[PDB]
Amino acid sequence: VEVLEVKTGVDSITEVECFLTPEMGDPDEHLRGFSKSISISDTFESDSPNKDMLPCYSVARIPLPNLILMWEAVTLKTEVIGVTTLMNVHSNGQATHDNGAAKPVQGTSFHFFSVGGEALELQGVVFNYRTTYPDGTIFPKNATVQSQVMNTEHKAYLDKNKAYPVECWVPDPTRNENTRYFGTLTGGENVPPVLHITNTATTVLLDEFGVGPLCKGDNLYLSAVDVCGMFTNRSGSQQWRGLSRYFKVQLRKRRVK
Amino acid sequence: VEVLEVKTGVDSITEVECFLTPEMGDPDEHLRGFSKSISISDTFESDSPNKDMLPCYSVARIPLPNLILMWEAVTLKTEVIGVTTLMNVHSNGQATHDNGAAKPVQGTSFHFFSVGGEALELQGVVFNYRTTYPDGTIFPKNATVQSQVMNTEHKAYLDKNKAYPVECWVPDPTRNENTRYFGTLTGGENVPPVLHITNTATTVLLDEFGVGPLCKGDNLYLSAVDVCGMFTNRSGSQQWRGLSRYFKVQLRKRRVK
Amino acid sequence: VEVLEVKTGVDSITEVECFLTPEMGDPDEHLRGFSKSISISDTFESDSPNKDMLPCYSVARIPLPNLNILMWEAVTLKTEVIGVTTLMNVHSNGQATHDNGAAKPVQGTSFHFFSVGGEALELQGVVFNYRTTYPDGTIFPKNATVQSQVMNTEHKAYLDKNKAYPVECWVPDPTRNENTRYFGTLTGGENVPPVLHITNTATTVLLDEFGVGPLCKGDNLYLSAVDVCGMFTNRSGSQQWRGLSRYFKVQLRKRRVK
Amino acid sequence: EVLEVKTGVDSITEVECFLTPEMGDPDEHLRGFSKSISISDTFESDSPNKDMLPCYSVARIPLPNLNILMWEAVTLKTEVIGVTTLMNVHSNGQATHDNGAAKPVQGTSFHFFSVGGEALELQGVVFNYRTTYPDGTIFPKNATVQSQVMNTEHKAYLDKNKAYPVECWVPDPTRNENTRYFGTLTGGENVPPVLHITNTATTVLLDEFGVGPLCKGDNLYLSAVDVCGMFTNRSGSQQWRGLSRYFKVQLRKRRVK
Amino acid sequence: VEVLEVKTGVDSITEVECFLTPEMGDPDEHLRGFSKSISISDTFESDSPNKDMLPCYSVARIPLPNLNILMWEAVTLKTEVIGVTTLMNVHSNGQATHDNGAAKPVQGTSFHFFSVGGEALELQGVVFNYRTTYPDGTIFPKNATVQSQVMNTEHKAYLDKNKAYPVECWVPDPTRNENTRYFGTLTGGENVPPVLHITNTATTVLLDEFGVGPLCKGDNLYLSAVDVCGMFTNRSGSQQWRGLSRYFKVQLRKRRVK
Numbered sequence A, B: 001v002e003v004l005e006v007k008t009g010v011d012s013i014t015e016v017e018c019f020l021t022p023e024m025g026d027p028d029e030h031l032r033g034f035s036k037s038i039s040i041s042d043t044f045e046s047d048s049p050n051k052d053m054l055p056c057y058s059v060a061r062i063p064l065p066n067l068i069l070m071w072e073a074v075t076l077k078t079e080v081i082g083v084t085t086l087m088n089v090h091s092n093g094q095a096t097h098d099n100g101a102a103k104p105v106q107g108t109s110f111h112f113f114s115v116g117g118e119a120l121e122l123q124g125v126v127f128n129y130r131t132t133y134p135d136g137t138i139f140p141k142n143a144t145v146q147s148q149v150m151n152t153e154h155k156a157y158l159d160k161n162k163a164y165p166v167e168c169w170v171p172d173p174t175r176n177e178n179t180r181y182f183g184t185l186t187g188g189e190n191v192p193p194v195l196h197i198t199n200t201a202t203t204v205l206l207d208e209f210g211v212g213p214l215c216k217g218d219n220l221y222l223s224a225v226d227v228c229g230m231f232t233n234r235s236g237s238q239q240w241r242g243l244s245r246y247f248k249v250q251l252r253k254r255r256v257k
Numbered sequence C, E: 001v002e003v004l005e006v007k008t009g010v011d012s013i014t015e016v017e018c019f020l021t022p023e024m025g026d027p028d029e030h031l032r033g034f035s036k037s038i039s040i041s042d043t044f045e046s047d048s049p050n051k052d053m054l055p056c057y058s059v060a061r062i063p064l065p066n067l068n069i070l071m072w073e074a075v076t077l078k079t080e081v082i083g084v085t086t087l088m089n090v091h092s093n094g095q096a097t098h099d100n101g102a103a104k105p106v107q108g109t110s111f112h113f114f115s116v117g118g119e120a121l122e123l124q125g126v127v128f129n130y131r132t133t134y135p136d137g138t139i140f141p142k143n144a145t146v147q148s149q150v151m152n153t154e155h156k157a158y159l160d161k162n163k164a165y166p167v168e169c170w171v172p173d174p175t176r177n178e179n180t181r182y183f184g185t186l187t188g189g190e191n192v193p194p195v196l197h198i199t200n201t202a203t204t205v206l207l208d209e210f211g212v213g214p215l216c217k218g219d220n221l222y223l224s225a226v227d228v229c230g231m232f233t234n235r236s237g238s239q240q241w242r243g244l245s246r247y248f249k250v251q252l253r254k255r256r257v258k
Numbered sequence D: 001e002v003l004e005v006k007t008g009v010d011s012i013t014e015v016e017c018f019l020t021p022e023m024g025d026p027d028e029h030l031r032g033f034s035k036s037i038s039i040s041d042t043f044e045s046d047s048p049n050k051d052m053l054p055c056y057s058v059a060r061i062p063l064p065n066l067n068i069l070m071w072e073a074v075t076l077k078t079e080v081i082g083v084t085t086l087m088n089v090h091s092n093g094q095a096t097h098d099n100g101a102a103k104p105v106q107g108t109s110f111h112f113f114s115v116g117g118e119a120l121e122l123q124g125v126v127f128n129y130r131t132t133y134p135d136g137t138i139f140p141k142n143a144t145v146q147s148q149v150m151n152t153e154h155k156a157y158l159d160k161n162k163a164y165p166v167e168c169w170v171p172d173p174t175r176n177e178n179t180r181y182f183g184t185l186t187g188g189e190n191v192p193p194v195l196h197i198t199n200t201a202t203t204v205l206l207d208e209f210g211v212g213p214l215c216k217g218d219n220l221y222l223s224a225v226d227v228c229g230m231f232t233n234r235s236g237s238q239q240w241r242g243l244s245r246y247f248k249v250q251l252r253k254r255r256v257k
């Protein structure tokens, strides 16, 4: 399709505002936003994580006003919601030293968001190809030792919530022409969360040709991961803790051939 | 309201200058700027922090010269006051190693400020929905497991000083059109404070259309949190320590219809 | 080479898109992307690392559409480390950070490097310890002397073979490489956290200060990479380097030369 | 009223000097160091020895006599002098581990400098209002518990060298209109010094109206603090270590009414 | 000197390209690039470091094409630390970070410094401890007093000899050096990770605020450096400074002066 001119007039712009909840595993009715405590396999070959222990990608498909014109996503404001919850250092955590406050949430984090006019395209890569991923997840199939670095058979769409585990999928850099994505992995058991909030920062979604994601079938795709670190229980057991992400996207009508 | 032209001339600008004190809990008559020492609950479900153990958001409502014209906030200079107090490593503390100086204030910090033409709008998010917040604080009511990630029932206004606990409220990104807010949470038990001071830095408060916060009823709302970290006593017990925040805001008269 | 005008027209541009797999040592059939566990010699004179223990530079020579004097000129690069989220696997027979805790994540010394050129990357040999014996099957600084620990100009090579040039004994030669653009960061320390950014919105321009990108001799583009992310610690305490693949997308245009 | 700048080869001058640190100087061999740091048992009993307290440095520099013209400070180059001294890890130190080199200078730092046309204006803030500041220092008088966050009674001028302790005074952000100040407090017991040197970096001292500090009575005021960290002796006792600061200021003649 | 116009034409420009080796002490014939292991004095007054334990400033005086009034003006610099990947040798008589682990990498206090000038770098002496006795064969602050621990204006010198001026007791004199451009960073702490970037795409402009670079008196260019990367800990726990070489490429042009 050739991309032609932008429509103007009051009717030619719309905005989407929503939040995506994290999908950390939710091991019971009290533990939304947390994973199951992490257990370590006894051998490398026997790695077999339970579903409730695996954070997954979040995705939302947002219907847009029914419209060839297509909605074009132009700008994004985004923010992690509830950053201050990490100041709760009194809820049966593990004291940092005798008589001290509880160790706060810290350690490995992944903060990721994307906006596209279609599902985020994923490529599978595994730390350990002999990992058995659990029933109820969607994972790289027929994994081989090459899957530990790059196996081009592992292609997928982020088209279901609570399904695609964070650890075995990444955005496919060979695709995603119609999505804009951004992510940071910060590894290490002691890394401090650094979480900024403001309502004054905007990301522009236009490519080098001045064209944003074009929304196929009048749907906008939002995806996110916000694993903030791990919470350490009094006992020493550790659980991933996630937070929700706010999205505000401005869109305009674009004519295409 | 339609936003029209800025008024000019001698009478057309004013400035507000003030400071907001921190509200860290103030557990006795000698401990202004500190919280009660932190105790950890025996079970996750039994989390029940004392009011004096909970830092709260600070807020001041500043009356402006009586004026349709509205005062429009254009610029901000702001600074944390008393940064050098953290060099007192010679009292009541715990030696870092044998014969050493006292461990300084360090660990989790939250530094936050906002300027608006009405009260800061808040969204409640809790680390643990079964936490019992104490009498005398304003907290998310009817919390459910969903409140651990996002429950849209928890809406409030920062309309009372020394009342809204930092750990269960954040600025609501879905509102606050008439406020500009900025915050950073830095977690981890050993993170060092890094506090910059200068009288040469200005933040511009105008939005993408050149319009700043417009002060309803001729009132300016300033809000802050500056939890710098925790002080460690000889025994190992820890108390939050906060500092005051300076604000200087320049405003101009704006006609609206 | 007198560089003259760029060609225009639909036929005058092309793109290369590919990935380079990491070459960390691959000690057995199950450990692609990992090195052999690291052992330490008791003296400098007895340093004799096995090949499987040594990360090597990755390189690919990519044939371009045949020309002919026109040369393909590399103008822009998008690049990304592939599989960053694998580092969230803290459940696979690692070493618990404390009693009942999750496994220690991959961390420690990293080297992230990539280059795009119109010919093989030119290397200079430098060694931590001149008495290290590099193993059969690797290409290494020959006739090393104690001066090789700081600079010995005899140690010149081309990155012309995959999984052969060990990362620790070669660097890009700053005295050469006029027809390549290279970028690298070494972050040392046993506890340093990986910080890995991904996005499809970032482009690096490959043009020099005169507006000229690498010119592809014999219609070949050379891509090189190292992405040692840190070390994985096993339950036993033994440590292995872990690497990831790197994606490259390069835009090229036809340039006339004299 | 600020009017035009004078031109001509005679319309400019410069000041070049250095300010020595004032760390306490506990004996004839320990210039640049404080006395070893001890820890009082309680806030109430806190009574630091004069030789244990770093103080602000200040110099009042007479300028060429003018009279209405004033000297206007336009640019600053500044540098910490002697950064490589911190590579002496072989002198009376505490080995980091068996057979190791000495632990280097590290921990809490405060780096601060200012250039003004009159004395730096100070605001008193104290970590602990019951601290008894020693004879020979100038400190907040009639401190109350409110002095721990903000007590507007504690106003002073930095008008004497070796006298104003760093820990109980900061620049007063409510004043200092005729000064430019810059500082960073980096806390934590183990934080590493990061000290940059170059002769290629210039700070412009002009405000948003294009006006620099105007030198009242033809005096320029320079102030500094450069507490680099603490030096740990073999026994583990710790002392503040400071370094001198270079200033080069360019000034021009400005007419005023 | 009044500075007048730049000369143009093919003959009006020249380049200097070289490397400066680190001078860390070189305690024996196998340890070029390292210092002697660091020992600690038991008092301030007894501090008496041996020469081979003291890193020194590196300097090269580079003769330029003879001109005579014209002077060579240094305009741009490209510079790089050479051999950054040697720090990935964590298998050579180091100290395991934990049982069965790899060796602790080079880390801790670093100083990275370079300068380009039209005359010798001007130095100011400052000492950690004025009672330190600096060794025979070094050039050090003479007649040191307690004031030498903060600032003693007697301690003025020129960086005019290689392997001679210890890093720890000398810095560039900010009160002079008008005809030099210098840049340095000291990163302290015993555990700080080295962070070393390499690229052939970065240039530093040496022109001052008037558009004038360093002017080469007597047609000599002065290059100086220090690259103490950190300390290497051997198996016994003893620690030695480790340094690396620095590459310089400087472009110069002819400038008329009066």
Ligand SMILES: CC(=O)N[C@H]1[C@H]([C@H](O)[C@H](O)CO)O[C@@](O[C@H](CO)[C@@H](O)[C@@H]2O[C@@](O)(C(=O)O)C[C@H](O)[C@H]2NC(C)=O)(C(=O)O)C[C@@H]1O
Pocket (backbone or CB within 6 Å): A027, A031, A034, A035, A036, A037, A092, A233, A234, A235, A236, A237, A239, B043, B044, C100
């Ligand atoms: C935030 C929170 O709810 N923390 C609690 C955790 C948490 O619910 C689970 O770890 C989620 O996976 O549970 C803690 O107690 C558990 C459960 O009862 C432990 O005592 C473990 O119980 C076992 O029965 C089990 O889970 O199978 C046996 C196991 O050996 C126990 N683990 C340990 C380390 O003792 C917890 O500490 O993990 C309580 C915590 O407040």
Ligand SMILES: CC(=O)N[C@H]1[C@H]([C@H](O)[C@H](O)CO)O[C@@](O[C@H](CO)[C@@H](O)[C@@H]2O[C@@](O)(C(=O)O)C[C@H](O)[C@H]2NC(C)=O)(C(=O)O)C[C@@H]1O
Pocket (backbone or CB within 6 Å): A099, B027, B031, B035, B036, B037, B092, B233, B234, B235, B236, B237, B239, D042, D043
């Ligand atoms: C700066 C300061 O005032 N430090 C003192 C603190 C401080 O006043 C409180 O922690 C503020 O909440 O108190 C220290 O003593 C306390 C009581 O004064 C402890 O002994 C605790 O007393 C209890 O009664 C209590 O609940 O507060 C019982 C508790 O078991 C005690 N805790 C400990 C760790 O012993 C203190 O160390 O916290 C003295 C300190 O100088």
Ligand SMILES: CC(=O)N[C@H]1[C@H]([C@H](O)[C@H](O)CO)O[C@@](O[C@H](CO)[C@@H](O)[C@@H]2O[C@@](O)(C(=O)O)C[C@H](O)[C@H]2NC(C)=O)(C(=O)O)C[C@@H]1O
Pocket (backbone or CB within 6 Å): A043, A044, C027, C031, C034, C035, C036, C037, C093, C234, C235, C236, C237, C238, C240, E100
């Ligand atoms: C990711 C992975 O495969 N980890 C396993 C490693 C790994 O395969 C090798 O270290 C790669 O070089 O092996 C672990 O077990 C090995 C045997 O496979 C050890 O028991 C070591 O075996 C030796 O035979 C050997 O030289 O490799 C002898 C050596 O003494 C043993 N080392 C130790 C520290 O016990 C491993 O822990 O290294 C298992 C791990 O899951």
Ligand SMILES: [K+]
Pocket (backbone or CB within 6 Å): A045, A046, A047, A048, A130, A131, A132
């Ligand atoms: K398995």
Ligand SMILES: [K+]
Pocket (backbone or CB within 6 Å): A173, A174, A175, C017
């Ligand atoms: K593509």
Ligand SMILES: [K+]
Pocket (backbone or CB within 6 Å): B045, B046, B047, B048, B130, B131, B132
């Ligand atoms: K409760």
Ligand SMILES: [K+]
Pocket (backbone or CB within 6 Å): A017, B173, B174, B175
């Ligand atoms: K809104």
Ligand SMILES: [K+]
Pocket (backbone or CB within 6 Å): C044, C045, C046, C047, C048, C131, C132, C133
């Ligand atoms: K050998």
Ligand SMILES: [K+]
Pocket (backbone or CB within 6 Å): C174, C175, C176, E017
């Ligand atoms: K060259």
Ligand SMILES: [K+]
Pocket (backbone or CB within 6 Å): D043, D044, D045, D046, D047, D130, D131, D132
């Ligand atoms: K007292």
Ligand SMILES: [K+]
Pocket (backbone or CB within 6 Å): B017, D173, D174, D175
């Ligand atoms: K004021």
Ligand SMILES: [K+]
Pocket (backbone or CB within 6 Å): E044, E045, E046, E047, E048, E131, E132, E133
């Ligand atoms: K001596």
Ligand SMILES: [K+]
Pocket (backbone or CB within 6 Å): D016, E174, E175, E176
């Ligand atoms: K000078």
